[PDB]
Write a structure and sequence with these properties.
The structure is a homooctamer. Chain A is α/β, with parallel strands linked by helices. Chain A has one domain: Rossmann fold (3-Layer(aba) Sandwich), CATH 3.40.50.1000. The first copy, chain A, has 6 helices and 8 strands. Chain A has a 6-stranded parallel β-sheet. Chain A has a two-stranded antiparallel ribbon with strand order 2-3. In chain A, helix 1 packs parallel to helix 6. At the C-F interface, helix 4, helix 5 and strand 8 of C face helix 4, helix 5 and strand 8 of F. The structure holds calcium ion (12 copies) and chloride ion (CL) (8 copies). One chloride ion binds next to helix 1 of chain D. Chains B, E: Homotetramer. Chains B, E: This is N-acylneuraminate cytidylyltransferase. Chains B, E: Belongs to the KdsC family. Belongs to the CMP-NeuNAc synthase family.
């Protein structure tokens, strides 16, 4: 029915934007160009649970800085980053695995996520997403990016105990 | 996909009342008389949208004592005390010669979802029930009662409403 | 399970404080002392869903408050107001309904609710409750009094669909 | 100096919008269409101080609004309401007072104030004003409409002591 | 120095009205009839303080149409429509046999400063004028109209008001 | 007295969870995977005040991340971390210290704290705790984790001056 | 049209202040005096979108702190910083680029931006700007510095999709 | 008069607490014990102006970590830190210079500032100060610690332009 949240039976894969989706879009920088971002332990918990349930996972980012890959390492899920066209990378990634895009949940926050949203069955915007992104999503989290939005999504799929 | 509605996309604006033009609160006295708060910014936006030639309607399930008074002030028709808003909307569209695809409908709660399904441009206020926020084609940044309709008016008519 | 939210299986009755619980604790007054309060349509929906589900309902208020009686009539649930002691009135009411207090959910916000909290199995504080009351509760809403706290509780019992 | 706040030396008149400027833009309504609005005691104090200081005062509102006239009486300042065009009424009012529009401070919040802003030397937006209005102003309050924005402006003119 | 007032420090609690027990807003109708919002938590706190035996008073400069009605509900005396609150307070202290040093006075604005000077325990609400916040001996964390008196009651009587 | 806040007479020990309790549950990470967390100076002052009052202190954590020990070092309080089962570690520690679990205050924020909550007399949830944890607690702070929740608890136990000053406002030695 | 927001037709250049405009005006400092600042990825996307649209870009700053250049490097836009007089540097730069100051958008937050504001056609204050700066501006963002104020400005100029997608929602190449 | 803010003629010295007064009381830490804090550029501006006006300045802290001294170096003002008793250090500091404590402005936020407050003529609390500290101050800033509270204080002493 219209507006229904995704369930475990609806999806085979979870693809996550990084900055602004797993973070609050802020980046700490030094004079050398080193970057730091804040991630949320609740998201860690949610991602670990989704991973353990057998879902195919990906972090997808246009950002070249290795900080995204450092987070991906901690979470033990694949990362594709420094990609010019997010949507083309996503299309190719689905086709390499024979995954139906209709059974992909993709989480984003800004306008460079919109072409990905159009490709997949379950586009999800974090609460802090920009206007047109919030609208284009099939579901919207109540928790903002960097505050545990991915844990909230994990609870939709796996239930409140994250079983 | 990443597009707010524009004046070229729509011929009608249909508005829920409680929780969309209000914050979903009702002030009550000892007799059970009811009062609600509306927003003057919404009034300004509604007047600009009406002046631009858009066909407008307020649609509500409440025997709302006050919605007819508000409609009268805004100089737009009202249909209220209806258990099937979607059928009322469909009937109104037919009577007005307006295609549902060209209707912007603004709501906040689960009883708006059947209306959302019928129209081209379902819009949720920021304070909408979680499922309604997702179901909408666009979502306002300001909540019901705080000028959500005023914000929609600027999407359609520009920041100066001109 | 420690901290578990109540479900339909756990409760036979829902008893509600009024000011601060179904309202933000404010009262509009005129020169003659006439009182007006703000209630929430979402609470109205949640209360109707709980009533429709067959739960025995009650509003309890210490002072004779004609505004509470007006609200109760609208909600189609009984009210006991103008009573010496909320907790004793509640105890008598349970004994008469044949209802185990262990299966009563009572919602409150301030220290005058503590004797009721001690009597029932499922004391619930609204988010805006005072410190000691938040602690004394078995569950605490995320939504404050007058903002839809009762609708939240209704969602615990009946699901986010309210059925 | 670019961006300087107005002082007593700069202005001969203070003209005030009502809804959204002296209020939070909300209107309480009943079934008969009777209207009620909330005004701020701090604004009352600020307005009395400006009036006492000898400044020529006026409230301007497009619609015939009996509530605005009640407020104006309390404040002991005149009101022009039920007028075709705010800006033309203002222009005529200035011409009659003998006051240079360059030395008029006008406070507003929405796009219907822009013609007035264009006419006067000191257009002032309340903090809660809409984007284009905040920009169009010569000064912007930090306090929103209905929260004491007029008292803030009175403090610019007379000091935080209001004298 | 770093001490909130306790029951042993005071014999009286004197309360300003607008902006202290209210958010300083007034609702008006077309006739100029005035309505204000008070707080039930404040009511509970005031009742506990009164029950503990503290001598209490509301003091206001407003011909406030509604302050006498509120005082009547709270079962405490009121003095209002007074241009010199400080002299009213001094007179009341003399009549009550209460030493000003043992009075907790709660206010929010510059017209409270002369009262602040007379008493041992001047308290500003969080939303007080900037100078009044500094002038006070203690400052509440909650603003006027939001339960500032309820918060003071817990300083004097403990979190459970017992 | 239902809902009463803990006082100095009620407790002999204060045991603290770390992430989400002394922090906002976020981690700052750099290009190379180094982790940083934000703690609060108010918490630090509260913890030192509790320690000076003679309460037995402890930070308890599940994870290997050495940042917790670094915080514990600065605070001069012991750590029990990298632990398989948190609650068992706590039960054993209580036994070994000769402290009755009924007189232990434990502060936490997440569902993995619930077994510790069940063990102790005074479970306390930070304002930002998971919904079920706020309910399960005997007391709930108003201030969230990383924002001075432990400083708030310290004021429940020691009063508004953290026992640094007496009534008349003079410096407390001891 | 009084108060109108800038559009693509109004401007040929976008010049940005740094601290307080692309940041929240705070600096993170460590035990050894190293300085860090927080910038915003939304601003980064907005800036790149403006640059791709053919607007001449520039970051202008008074201070020697090299962090600004590091940001400018990542954004692929020139820096003019460590400058004695900001406004003179800007007037000269406009002249040298063949850009009329009336078609320059300058974003700032503090009183030292007022002379630049006077120079240009489209001075813009971030929401968090000093009170006099908010007044002096021709437009004021709703979002504060460091929170995506430049991303907001980018949406004024390019629309809600930042010109990455057309009406019908297809990818814009050019 | 009661509650009056300090002026330039009232004071000869400004002594500043660090954590929570020039910061928001947060500290970023690594596994090695390195600390980072966030300071505000507005405070930098205000402190530079107070320094240039000829006031004797000090940053005073019980914190042993060198981060406080790094900030003091950037601001070019003396620091005394790692001090056991803040109040005793302050008393000694005043006496070494023959400064009257009545003409000292001291800014703080927490209970370890109270004995310093009692020593000086002009104790000032930042807006975010703890309850008893806000009360004990002679003046309270409107801006919280780490948000430009010292700039606000500088404006009291030197005027809005910080001349
Ligand atoms: Ca992103
Ligand atoms: Ca509705
Ligand atoms: Ca949608
Ligand atoms: Ca209540
Ligand atoms: Ca509990
Ligand atoms: Ca207006
Ligand atoms: Ca301007
Ligand atoms: Ca008052
Ligand atoms: Ca004081
Ligand atoms: Ca934790
Ligand atoms: Ca700057
Ligand atoms: Ca400090
Ligand atoms: Cl994690
Ligand atoms: Cl209206
Ligand atoms: Cl209802
Ligand atoms: Cl008034
Ligand atoms: Cl009451
Ligand atoms: Cl610390
Ligand atoms: Cl970026
Ligand atoms: Cl600085």
């Amino acid at each position: 029915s219209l507006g229904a949240l995704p369930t475990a039976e609806d999806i085979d894969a979870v693809v996550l934007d990084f900055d602004g989706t797993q973070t609050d879009d802020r980046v700490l920088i030094d004079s050398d160009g080193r970057e730091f971002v804040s991630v949320h332990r609740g998201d860690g918990l949610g991602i670990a649970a989704l991973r353990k349930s057998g879902l195919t996972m990906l972090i997808l980012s246009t950002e070249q800085n290795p900080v995204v890959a450092a987070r991906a390492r901690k979470l033990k899920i694949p990362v594709l980053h420094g990609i010019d066209r997010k949507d083309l990378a996503l299309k190719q990634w689905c086709e390499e695995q024979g995954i139906a895009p209709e059974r992909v949940l993709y989480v984003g926050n800004d306008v460079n996520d919109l072409p990905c949203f159009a490709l997949v069955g379950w586009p999800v915007a974090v609460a802090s997403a920009h206007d047109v992104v919030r609208g284009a999503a099939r579901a919207v989290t109540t928790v903002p990016g960097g505050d545990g939005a991915i844990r909230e999504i994990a609870s939709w799929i796996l239930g409140p105990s994250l079983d």
